[model samples]
Target: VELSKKVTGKLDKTTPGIQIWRIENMEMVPVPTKSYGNFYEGDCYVLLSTRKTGSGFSYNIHYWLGKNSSQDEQGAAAIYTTQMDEYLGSVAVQHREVQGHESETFRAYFKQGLIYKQGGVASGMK
Candidate 1:
């Protein structure tokens, strides 16, 4: 639907915040921040965290993948993430991660750290 418009959702000029968007059948769905540090094993997700600085701003983008996530979902996540990167002035420092072998940036987002739980949306257990 408004997927294109969503990618255009740039960082706030003054305020900083965290956002997490999940990919479901090629559409983007916003997830609550409460699920920030956790992930399910069948879908791909994108995380956007913006920072406010003195007379400046910083943006970080993460394209996350579950162990059982499909390749199509992973690519879609990448495409969406790159779109966000473009909107964030062309480069938001991509943080690509798969379950288990995750990145360091994926850790500090929550004290509990990143965890991949069982149960997948598209991968089944339905």
Candidate 2:
């Protein structure tokens, strides 16, 4: 899933910090980061990025999963792949012994989670 945002200042990873927003009133709040889990369901991955002028940060192909609806989760997946081309990488289920046996694998990846971007302006004017 590809989404785009424009900014003027340095679009560093710290800009967004994982949580996207939707404002109810004067208060700004977090909106879901728009889960793309179904895209690669049989096996899935995450790639994050940011930028000031053109593009900012780039992400590796990190595997991930959803533990529960909320916090309180466990384990992290190993990076079976490395950063490939143009901030993109590939991760696969190296080996699968059983059906449910991969739960730990899922948990492992899930734990790796998403790298929250931070410290950047939504637009340079700010």
Highest TM-score, which number?
Answer: 1
After superposing candidate 1 on the true structure, give the runs of residues whose Cα lies further than 4 Å from its correct spot.
10-13, 24-27, 113-115, 119-126
lDDT, residue 68, candidate 2: 21
Q: Write the per-residue lDDT of candidate 1 for residues 19-125, one digit (tens) a residue.
A: 76766544456655777666664567777777876656677777777555567777877677787787778636677866654566567655566655563444544
**Candidate of highest lDDT:** 1
TM-score of each: 0.74, 0.21
**Candidate 2 — worst ten consecutive residues by lDDT sum?**
69-78
Tens-place lDDT digits, model 2, residues 50-119:
2233554443223232222111111111121121222222211122211234356434433444332222
Q: Which residue pairs show collisions in model 1?
A: none
Candidate 1 TM-score versus the reference? 0.74
